[PDB]
């Protein structure tokens, strides 16, 4: 007889990726703490567009 159903891969993938680029995120939206970015610079540029979904730290 033969038997041996072996083959299970555990899920593993950091939840830190720049929404804009995608490579890697270092910072995070200081308004909702959901949108990740590789740096404030990437946030400011992807902010005026992102904020269109989140409230934000300041309303102006």
Three-class SS of residue 27? Answer: strand
The smaller minimum CB distance to Zn ion, of residues 4 and 18, is found at 18
Check binding of 54 to Zn ion (CB under 5 A): yes
Sign of the C-alpha dihedral, residues 23, 25, 29, 33? positive
Check binding of 20 to Zn ion (CB under 5 A): yes
Size of the site for Zn ion (CB under 5 A): 10
Those residues whose C-beta lies under 8 Å from the C-beta of residue 54, and which sit 6 or more positions away, are 29, 31, 32, 34, 35
Check binding of 28 to Zn ion (CB under 5 A): no
Q: Which residues bind Zn ion (CB under 5 A)?
A: 18, 20-21, 29, 31-32, 35, 38, 42, 54
């Amino acid at each position: 007889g033969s038997s041996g159903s072996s083959g299970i891969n555990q899920q593993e993938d950091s939840s830190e990726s720049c929404w804009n680029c995608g490579r890697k995120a270092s910072e995070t939206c200081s308004g909702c703490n959901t949108a990740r970015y590789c740096g404030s610079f990437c946030q400011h540029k992807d902010w005026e567009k992102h904020h269109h979904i989140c409230s934000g730290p300041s309303s102006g």
